[PDB]
């Protein structure tokens, strides 16, 4: 099986990138994101990307999933911005929340031109990079309800 006349012949193209960049323009949460050095945090709430108030950054509900955008100046230019995007998956988050966090992490990457480097951060397995964002982490019991309807 080869690629040329197949349903993957348009993968990896500029067209794919253009379509996904346009889709990312339709998420209000990204408007104004990544405009200055710092950490921005959203939580998945019934499939929606919901900002976390600044005063609660660094506290994470174990039942929930989050997107954490770290904007910083790269070594190559002190006046430009680069990005690490971490998605944090609580030990008790549900499948809809983790899957939405993953998809929306890609979307935020798209919105920022592909520049963010993605990091999957499962509770208990957080990278040194993620730990360093909170010089600490506070884990809270509970979380918001799943967006899934349960099929009996």
């Amino acid at each position: 099986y080869n690629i040329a006349d197949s349903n993957i012949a348009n993968l990896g193209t500029e067209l794919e990138k253009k379509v996904k960049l346009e889709a990312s323009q339709h998420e209000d949460a990204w408007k104004g994101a990544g405009k200055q050095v710092g950490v921005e945090i959203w939580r998945i709430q019934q499939f929606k990307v919901v900002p976390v108030p600044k005063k609660h950054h660094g506290s994470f509900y174990t039942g929930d999933s989050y997107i954490v955008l770290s904007t910083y100046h790269p070594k190559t230019n002190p006046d430009k911005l680069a990005y690490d995007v971490h998605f944090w998956l609580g030990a008790f988050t549900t499948q809809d929340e983790a899957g939405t966090a993953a998809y929306k992490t890609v979307e935020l990457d798209d919105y920022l031109g592909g520049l963010p480097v993605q990091y999957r951060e499962v509770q208990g397995y957080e990278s040194e990079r993620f730990l360093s964002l909170f010089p600490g982490l506070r884990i809270l019991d509970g979380g918001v309800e799943t967006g899934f309807h349960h099929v009996e």
Partner: protein, 363 residues
């Protein structure tokens, strides 16, 4: 406004509503007609009349080969199972990678022109499974009834040059079990008898961690044998067939194929990817589909991939318990997101552009 999610497997339709945690309709992708040569029956009702019907699958190896019967399956899914009017529901369909472009062109044409859906999208099955696992990077082994695919994905983008495909999956394993059971003295030949063998396979087969040792164990005593009650009440005994059947996934020569086994196709797919991302793929091998349900398969994949990979490489096989439905669940999640729905083909766009639009919108 609720979107429909339909994962048209070669063997099973999984269908339901976006936002649900599981498909509400799961039934065989079959059309049955009288074995002696309404006029036809679909899905569970064809299964209900298996005694008098010959069963035909309109999808072979992930590709629709009987469009008239496929339309019957879709009509049945909408009107008889889900009991919805399809013109009222945006519809997400699925497809395996490396299919010929005409397959999704005709899928799009029939959805709009026959079923009058308001909008639709065709998604790559393995990508849906990766998102269902909560990942943007990993390599999916998606093995159903028709195709086994290796799909490496990095930061949400499948790497098309490294995607690999093998037309060996559950249907071939069922056929092989029918053959080797016939060689034990239990004749299974008809399309009806095949479905009994498929049940034996799902209930009793497993992947041995060391195949040669397991053959020796089976020949030395009956400690691995299992009894199985037939519909007529007769009790048969199966032995080494329990693990010889799925061993074919690792040794395709069992069915006369010279292809690499699933451990080797996985390794070969990782090796087609840039060196520095292989580490993330090795640690995130995600199993998807019914043919990855055999007990022992994750442990065997871990062993076999460890033997092929660098000695310093962290290897991990992820086996979601729900993986018979991972594709569908990933679709339910993505179809619940407004930005993903923004990418779907509308009826007005189809009316303007025709089937070619599917390649410009669905990635």
């Amino acid at each position: 406004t609720t979107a429909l999610v339909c994962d048209n497997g070669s063997g099973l339709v999984k269908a339901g509503f976006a936002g649900d945690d599981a498909p509400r309709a799961v039934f065989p992708s079959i059309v049955g007609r009288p074995r002696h040569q309404k006029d036809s029956y679909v899905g569970d009702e064809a299964q209900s009349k298996r005694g008098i019907l010959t069963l035909k699958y309109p999808i072979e190896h992930g590709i629709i080969t009987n469009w008239d019967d496929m339309e019957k399956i879709w009509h049945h899914t909408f009107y008889n199972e889900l009991r919805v009017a399809p013109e009222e529901h945006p519809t997400l369909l699925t497809e395996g990678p490396l299919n010929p472009k005409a397959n999704r062109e005709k899928m799009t044409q029939i959805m709009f022109e026959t079923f009058n859906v308001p909008a639709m999208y065709v998604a790559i099955q393995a990508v849906l499974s990766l998102y269902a696992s909560g990942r943007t990077t990993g390599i999916v082994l998606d093995s159903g009834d028709g195709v086994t695919h290796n799909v490496p994905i990095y930061e949400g983008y499948a790497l098309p040059h490294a995607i690999m495909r093998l037309d060996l999956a559950g249907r071939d394993l069922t056929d092989y079990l029918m053959k080797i059971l016939t060689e034990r003295g239990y004749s299974f030949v008809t399309t009806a008898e095949r479905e009994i063998v498929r049940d034996i396979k799902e209930k009793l087969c497993y992947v041995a961690l060391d195949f040669e040792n397991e053959m020796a164990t089976a020949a030395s005593s009956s400690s691995l044998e299992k009894s199985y009650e037939l519909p007529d009440g007769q009790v048969i005994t199966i032995g080494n067939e329990r693990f010889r059947c799925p061993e074919t996934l690792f040794q395709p020569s069992f069915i006369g194929m010279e292809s690499a086994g699933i451990h080797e196709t996985t390794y070969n797919s990782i090796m087609k990817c840039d060196i520095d991302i292989r580490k993330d793929l090795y640690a995130n091998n995600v199993l998807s589909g019914g043919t990855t349900m055999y007990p022992g398969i994750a442990d065997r994949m871990q062993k076999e991939i460890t033997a092929l990979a660098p000695s310093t490489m962290k290897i991990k096989i992820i086996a979601p318990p729900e993986r018979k439905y991972s594709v569908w669940i990933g679709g339910s999640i993505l179809a619940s997101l407004s930005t993903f729905q923004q990418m779907w083909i509308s009826k007005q766009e189809y009316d303007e552009a025709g089937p070619s639009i599917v390649h410009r919108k669905c990635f």
